[PDB]
Write a protein that binds this ligand. Sequence first.
Ligand SMILES: *[C@@H]1O[C@H](CO)[C@@H](O[C@@H]2O[C@H](CO)[C@@H](O[C@@H]3O[C@H](CO)[C@@H](O)[C@H](O[C@H]4O[C@H](CO)[C@@H](O)[C@H](O)[C@@H]4O[C@H]4O[C@H](CO)[C@@H](O)[C@H](O)[C@@H]4O)[C@@H]3O)[C@H](O)[C@H]2NC(C)=O)[C@H](O)[C@H]1NC(C)=O
Ligand SMILES: *[C@@H]1O[C@H](CO)[C@@H](O[C@@H]2O[C@H](CO)[C@@H](O[C@@H]3O[C@H](CO)[C@@H](O)[C@H](O[C@H]4O[C@H](CO)[C@@H](O)[C@H](O)[C@@H]4O[C@H]4O[C@H](CO)[C@@H](O)[C@H](O)[C@@H]4O)[C@@H]3O)[C@H](O)[C@H]2NC(C)=O)[C@H](O)[C@H]1NC(C)=O
Ligand SMILES: *[C@@H]1O[C@H](CO)[C@@H](O[C@@H]2O[C@H](CO)[C@@H](O[C@@H]3O[C@H](CO)[C@@H](O)[C@H](O)[C@@H]3O)[C@H](O)[C@H]2NC(C)=O)[C@H](O)[C@H]1NC(C)=O
Ligand SMILES: *[C@@H]1O[C@H](CO)[C@@H](O[C@@H]2O[C@H](CO)[C@@H](O)[C@H](O)[C@H]2NC(C)=O)[C@H](O)[C@H]1NC(C)=O
Ligand SMILES: *[C@@H]1O[C@H](CO)[C@@H](O[C@@H]2O[C@H](CO)[C@@H](O)[C@H](O)[C@H]2NC(C)=O)[C@H](O)[C@H]1NC(C)=O
Ligand SMILES: *[C@@H]1O[C@H](CO)[C@@H](O[C@@H]2O[C@H](CO)[C@@H](O)[C@H](O)[C@H]2NC(C)=O)[C@H](O)[C@H]1NC(C)=O
Ligand SMILES: *[C@@H]1O[C@H](CO)[C@@H](O)[C@H](O)[C@H]1NC(C)=O
Ligand SMILES: *[C@@H]1O[C@H](CO)[C@@H](O)[C@H](O)[C@H]1NC(C)=O
Ligand SMILES: *[C@@H]1O[C@H](CO)[C@@H](O)[C@H](O)[C@H]1NC(C)=O
Ligand SMILES: *[C@@H]1O[C@H](CO)[C@@H](O)[C@H](O)[C@H]1NC(C)=O
Lengths: 160, 160, 160, 323, 323, 323
Amino acid sequence: GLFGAIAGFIEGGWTGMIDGWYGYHHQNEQGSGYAADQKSTQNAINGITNKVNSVIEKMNTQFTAVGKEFNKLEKRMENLNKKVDDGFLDIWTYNAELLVLLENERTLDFHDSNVKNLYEKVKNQLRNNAKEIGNGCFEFYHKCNNECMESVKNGTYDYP
Amino acid sequence: GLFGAIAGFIEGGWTGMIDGWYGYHHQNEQGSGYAADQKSTQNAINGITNKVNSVIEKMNTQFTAVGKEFNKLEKRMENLNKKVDDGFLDIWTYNAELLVLLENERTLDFHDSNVKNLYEKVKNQLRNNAKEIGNGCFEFYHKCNNECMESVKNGTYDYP
Amino acid sequence: GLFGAIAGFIEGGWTGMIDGWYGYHHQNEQGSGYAADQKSTQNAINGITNKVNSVIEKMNTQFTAVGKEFNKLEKRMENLNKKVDDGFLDIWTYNAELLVLLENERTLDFHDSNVKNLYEKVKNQLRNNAKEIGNGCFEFYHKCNNECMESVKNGTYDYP
Amino acid sequence: SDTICIGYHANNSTDTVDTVLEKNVTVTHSVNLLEDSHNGKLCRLKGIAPLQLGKCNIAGWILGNPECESLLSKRSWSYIAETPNSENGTCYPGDFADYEELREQLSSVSSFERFEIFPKERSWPKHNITRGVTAACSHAGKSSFYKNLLWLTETNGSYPKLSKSYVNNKEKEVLVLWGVHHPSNIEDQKTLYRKENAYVSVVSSNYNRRFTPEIAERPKVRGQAGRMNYYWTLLEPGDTIIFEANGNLIAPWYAFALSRGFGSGIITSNASMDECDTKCQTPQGAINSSLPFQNIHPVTIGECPKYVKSTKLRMVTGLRNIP
Amino acid sequence: SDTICIGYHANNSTDTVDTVLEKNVTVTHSVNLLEDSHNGKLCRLKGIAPLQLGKCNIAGWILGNPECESLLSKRSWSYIAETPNSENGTCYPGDFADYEELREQLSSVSSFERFEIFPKERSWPKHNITRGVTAACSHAGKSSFYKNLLWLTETNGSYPKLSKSYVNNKEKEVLVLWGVHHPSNIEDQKTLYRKENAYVSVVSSNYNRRFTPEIAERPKVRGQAGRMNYYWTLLEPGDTIIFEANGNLIAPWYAFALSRGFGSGIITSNASMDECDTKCQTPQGAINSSLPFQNIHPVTIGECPKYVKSTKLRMVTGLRNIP
Amino acid sequence: SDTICIGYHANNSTDTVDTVLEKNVTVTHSVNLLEDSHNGKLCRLKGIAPLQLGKCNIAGWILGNPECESLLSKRSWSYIAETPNSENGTCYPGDFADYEELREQLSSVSSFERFEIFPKERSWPKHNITRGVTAACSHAGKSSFYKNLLWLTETNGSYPKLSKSYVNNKEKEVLVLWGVHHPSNIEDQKTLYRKENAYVSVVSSNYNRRFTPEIAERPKVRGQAGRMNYYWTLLEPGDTIIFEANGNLIAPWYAFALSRGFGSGIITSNASMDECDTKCQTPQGAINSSLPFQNIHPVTIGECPKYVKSTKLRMVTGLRNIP
Ligand SMILES: *[C@@H]1O[C@H](CO)[C@@H](O[C@@H]2O[C@H](CO)[C@@H](O[C@@H]3O[C@H](CO)[C@@H](O)[C@H](O[C@H]4O[C@H](CO)[C@@H](O)[C@H](O)[C@@H]4O[C@H]4O[C@H](CO)[C@@H](O)[C@H](O)[C@@H]4O)[C@@H]3O)[C@H](O)[C@H]2NC(C)=O)[C@H](O)[C@H]1NC(C)=O
Ligand SMILES: *[C@@H]1O[C@H](CO)[C@@H](O[C@@H]2O[C@H](CO)[C@@H](O[C@@H]3O[C@H](CO)[C@@H](O)[C@H](O[C@H]4O[C@H](CO)[C@@H](O)[C@H](O)[C@@H]4O[C@H]4O[C@H](CO)[C@@H](O)[C@H](O)[C@@H]4O)[C@@H]3O)[C@H](O)[C@H]2NC(C)=O)[C@H](O)[C@H]1NC(C)=O
Ligand SMILES: *[C@@H]1O[C@H](CO)[C@@H](O[C@@H]2O[C@H](CO)[C@@H](O[C@@H]3O[C@H](CO)[C@@H](O)[C@H](O)[C@@H]3O)[C@H](O)[C@H]2NC(C)=O)[C@H](O)[C@H]1NC(C)=O
Ligand SMILES: *[C@@H]1O[C@H](CO)[C@@H](O[C@@H]2O[C@H](CO)[C@@H](O)[C@H](O)[C@H]2NC(C)=O)[C@H](O)[C@H]1NC(C)=O
Ligand SMILES: *[C@@H]1O[C@H](CO)[C@@H](O[C@@H]2O[C@H](CO)[C@@H](O)[C@H](O)[C@H]2NC(C)=O)[C@H](O)[C@H]1NC(C)=O
Ligand SMILES: *[C@@H]1O[C@H](CO)[C@@H](O[C@@H]2O[C@H](CO)[C@@H](O)[C@H](O)[C@H]2NC(C)=O)[C@H](O)[C@H]1NC(C)=O
Ligand SMILES: *[C@@H]1O[C@H](CO)[C@@H](O)[C@H](O)[C@H]1NC(C)=O
Ligand SMILES: *[C@@H]1O[C@H](CO)[C@@H](O)[C@H](O)[C@H]1NC(C)=O
Ligand SMILES: *[C@@H]1O[C@H](CO)[C@@H](O)[C@H](O)[C@H]1NC(C)=O
Ligand SMILES: *[C@@H]1O[C@H](CO)[C@@H](O)[C@H](O)[C@H]1NC(C)=O
């Protein structure tokens, strides 16, 4: 979407990847399978959980009895009390809804960025020994066994 | 600006493109003209209107008579009422000012992102059949007629 | 982080560069040194300063005496006042905490974006006269003296 | 050689918005969020026109100050609007009990009928009903008095004790108002009521109060050294109010059968009436309530946008205008 | 030929969240922020159970209306809950002074003992202690009166002046309530109190009020044309309260030693009580206070999440679900 | 081979900020948003020094309790500060009418002159002006009384009815205070005022109240079983106030010509007064008003940053510090 990876050149998700949020799908002469990149998914699992807890845990609320009672000659104080309740009601409703609306878009942007950086991490490693098919895949020009595959994910891919 | 396209390597806007928000400018032996990419701009026209509609329409307001009247021996209630009006005034003014500044920054970042994704979509399609001029333009190494041009905008550019 | 430059392919910072926020480190036979790109750092110093002043100066506050006094037969007025004070306290506390949390994340994204755009400005100029090492450096294929170095930072790199 | 380029829109627009990083950014398309203007007119809220008082405030209007125009037809209003030149209230000096509370409760009514609760000519057969005029409440150069109250005085040398009752045979509340006169000296107290120590007692099922006149020399207000305190009560449907008096009773003459509505308010406005419908009323005029914020006035009535001290609030929809 | 691809997660989830650019976006994992339900039960705040009034409201319960169950132990409560069918208050018509204020102060107590402040059987040797009953407060077809007050009347043809004092030897506040009776005619005043002009005087170190009975014919309420107004005061530790009366005194019989707590409130709820602990009580029932927002009710008691008019508030944690 | 690299700043800084995704993030440069400290001194708001009462509270200072320092010159103050050791108020026990309201209205004045409204030595030729002392208001071991009031008593066996008037020839409001004495027994009432039934009447153009003494034995406060209720009124420019009394009048001796200011308040502070200027005053001390938030105290006076329960609020300006 915002970083062009998820809604973009990587057209869809992997139901086959149950291990994490972002990962790889390799295909070599030795076999094939899905594997999650625990380095990327953990930083997002950490960041998103820290974000969700910040919305919940930052709510400092004291002991309060909201209701107040007034009699026939205290209508003004009664209406002043409703103004306080409806004012807080209008404020909290508006801010809560927009907070969820704005910060949900950012969470999706956050995932898109992590996906974009992972693609960019592989492209910089596989500088030019493979053709970028444009859909998130890289077709190797040389035989890349499971050791060479695991070395791409590990971040230690030798250039030749 | 934030994605480097609008305030960056695509230095300026096209008053000649009246058809939409983002698009292409082609030049071949068959002619030259401006065309908008309605697929990308419509998703942006939809999202921004949904953004603006959320800000305006989520304002749930009930019926209220703000003013309250007090007499010479009710100044405390009058000042307590002044505290409620000035308090809501401070909250709304501060949040309203900041919301418009922050979300305007995001909207311009949003447009910046849509242009860069469109640029990157063309770059990925043409791969190396054209030279990247660096200003948002691609000089084709082959003759690209109108059929070849329309296929770039449609998203179906054949590589051979 | 979000654009992959600071926590990413440029793994660390330069304590040697005291002149600005972003800059260059050149290495040729003529010498070596750190230099800040005053064009990019100034735009960030300007943008951040306008952001910091918006949070501080948009706080329009009038004269107010918070305290209210009530007697033994005015406990309800006292609790309504406590509700007004505690209500504003919850709103400001909650909004202030999240405001710092959300906009600090954006400020760090802003620097990350400024760093990647600066890298991309140099890469676009040096098209293929240098190898992109993947760590923020360019290894020149030709001898680039200090005159050529000042031109890369200045934006005036002749291609042939 | 052939080329294709990627670019974005630009126009003749001069709209500017503020961002968090940069002020005064010229953009192509933008939308306003701040309601900035009013129409300068008092409009109808909830389709109901307001009650516009002219020379009189709520006190003078509800008591019947001789300078206020009466609405002898059954009425209703969504809010009350009085002018900055509404200086006619209680023309005879005194204290109006719970006046602000009464103002807040008459602010919105769905029905309002003024009716003769105690017909002047036959409710007081053993008291004088024509002497109760005063120069303080003068109309057209002759002395007069409130149009909804009656100043009972002695006749044939006596002021007998009275006991007049009213049962609320209406199917709604009945606002009943009355006054107690406190003379300036004991000699005028004997002249008007033929007793030194009198009493007024007004009772219902929920109202129970006794008033004893306090005689003392006071500064003259509107030329009067005496005072009259004004009191009211809302008499519930089916309930009875009983007036028992020894003297000094400013008896009710007209009352008001009414049904109060969801609380509204009062605006003070130099603005005029128009045949318009609005959802939000400002003392300066009516405003559009579609935008979320307004900066016209903080004291509004209706379903109103939140008041802000801001002068410009616009959201960018288009791009940076870079021609 | 070998390949490697970069991708992201997808699930069977059907959760949708709203974003600023797009509504109803299908996501893989999400968390709810809006507390949406209650348990339909009254629970204990700070581990203390509420005071549940049934047939009576706070007035009738504190006065001792014959239809209310009395407190026989050293009770305590975190809030007060009264039923929509709590219509038994002052069975004898009158005004309860500062009633709403007394309710706000009795809303939370940590100790509460009912004790004989002026024992009926030994405190009034020269007054009648049995005549003070009325058909307005009838129980089981016979006339009665409040269980915590005593209606003193004449005996042997006289009502001598009384002066009864109480010293607060408790180490807490003592709520003392009493009443002042207002007959309908001078004959009823002479029968009960053997004088036309009586007075009631209640004094402490901070309280000083004299009550004069106002005699007048009023409409009948609960069959009674007379009224008796009700009064109370909180007597500080070590302070003395003195009742001095000529007649018309509804003398205190029981009072309440109490310790008031950090201000709570009263909910009106037909919901039933359960053996549960909560941090937030709603008139419909208790709610979980973990989430920052709730839409159950705006009137809450406890350590509560803020009330919003929203129906859906959840934050996405996962990605867009694109299977 | 030659190289050019792109990089960013790093320094020795150890400032940490919180982000929404990560806590305790070390950054290069940052700015604080939360005001964290005070100076421990009471400062001047709007350049005007506060009125700091020492041994006395507002009650004792305005009445003239013998332990309070008097104002010699025409003064002015932006707010009032009283000490936790301010226990000298109404040394003769009684009720102060609308005391909290008088405190709110005297909180800020722009001019304040104390003047002899009714000179003691020449205003009361036919009453005793020297007997009015009491051991409850003793100064230096001898009996004394309020310095701004006069306790009139009988002379030659009589207390004739008095009528002293004051016309407000000043061009500002005049706060007038007075008292009504309520003896403990009829013997003290006869001794001091030579009447069983007396009355006090205070009237103006907008103030109208008559006071009847209530005689009853009460618990002793400061050794006194009697009480004095205290009353006040703001006399508008040009208006005349009239005192009429049979006895029990605690007559005004000094009054106050004053001009009230934009509503302020009262802080309780053991902190000392200093020659400092602030835009925001906290009971513990003055704070800088540059930052948008402060966590010192919720009860402030002035143009103050919003109070938050936060402990750390700083925005990052620089980058992540990676040395
Ligand atoms: C309906 O409202 C209109 C206006 O909205 C009322 O009309 C105005 O009424 C006032 C009051 O009568 C009148 O002002 C008086 O004009 C007199 C000359 O025509 C003056 O002699 C009089 O002066 C007194 O008040 C001054 C206040 O500044 C004092 O400074 C002055 O000393 C006078 O006071 C004497 O009077 C009192 C007793 O009243 C005495 O105790 C004092 O010691 C002193 O001796 C007023 O200024 C306006 O001229 C009227 N204006 C208009 C346009 O009509 C109208 O009366 C209202 N009608 C009803 C029925 O309520
Ligand atoms: C505890 O609460 C319960 C429940 O609320 C109480 O029980 C209710 O008691 C009331 C009595 O007040 C009873 O209603 C009355 O029934 C009477 C017998 O039929 C009626 O005569 C009486 O009518 C009067 O009120 C009507 C209301 O509009 C009038 O229209 C009617 O005319 C009556 O008004 C008076 O008129 C004349 C003078 O002209 C006078 O002579 C009459 O006697 C009358 O006084 C009421 O309808 C309810 O039915 C009871 N409900 C239940 C469920 O039992 C109970 O009393 C409370 N106990 C305590 C101790 O507080
Ligand atoms: C101004 O305030 C001071 C401080 O409260 C007053 O002094 C106090 O006076 C009271 C009595 O009025 C003292 O309490 C009594 O003490 C005596 C023995 O000392 C005892 O017999 C009583 O039972 C009671 O406990 C109190 O100790 C005393 N405190 C101090 C610090 O002196 C002073 O009277 C006030 N002055 C005026 C004019 O209001
Ligand atoms: C009611 O009072 C009025 C006013 O005092 C009486 O009318 C006055 O009568 C005298 C002498 O008869 C005339 O000089 C006045 O001009 C009259 N004044 C008015 C305003 O008419 C009237 O007679 C009294 N009526 C009763 C029944 O007591
Ligand atoms: C108090 O007054 C009541 C009157 O209600 C007395 O009770 C009555 O006593 C007489 C004779 O003593 C009987 O004929 C009545 O039947 C009684 N009525 C009731 C309702 O009991 C009572 O004795 C008086 N008590 C005192 C101590 O004087
Ligand atoms: C006012 O009261 C004072 C005090 O009661 C009177 O002064 C007293 O006069 C008697 C008579 O000689 C003396 O025995 C007392 O010793 C005096 N008291 C004091 C404190 O000195 C005074 O006479 C009364 N009258 C006037 C006009 O002051
Ligand atoms: C904003 O910029 C325009 C030109 O772009 C200028 O005419 C105008 O005065 C500026 N306004 C402010 C408030 O800076
Ligand atoms: C949201 O999308 C789902 C997709 O299946 C649809 O079933 C549902 O009705 C939609 N809800 C709304 C409110 O549009
Ligand atoms: C009642 O008063 C009469 C008066 O003569 C007296 O004889 C009788 O003893 C008194 N009764 C009581 C119980 O005091
Ligand atoms: C914040 O992080 C640093 C990292 O070196 C750590 O030393 C410090 O203890 C942390 N903060 C606190 C309050 O412990």
